[PDB]
Amino acid sequence: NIDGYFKIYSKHTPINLVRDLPQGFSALEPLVDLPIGINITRFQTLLA
């Protein structure tokens, strides 16, 4: 959240691994930018 704009950058990549955060390297692309202005102090996810 930068000067009233929220921003999302993301990636999806294929793997084969059992346990931990895969060691290696890739960048995230910017997906969406929104002019929301709010104070994000904190957050939560959403399960289904």
Q: In terms of CB distance, is 22 or 36 closer to another protein?
A: 36
Q: In terms of CB distance, is 31 or 36 closer to another protein?
A: 36
Size of the site for ligand NAG (CB under 6 A): 3
The verdict on 38 binding ligand NAG (CB under 6 A) reads yes
The verdict on 37 binding ligand NAG (CB under 6 A) reads yes
Q: CA 41 to CA 43: how far, in whole Å?
A: 7
Instruction: Render 6-41 in DSSP notation, one character per residue.
Output: EEEEE-------SSS---S--PPEEEEEE-------
* DSSP SS3 for 10: strand
Residues found near ligand NAG in the complex (CB under 6 A): 37-39
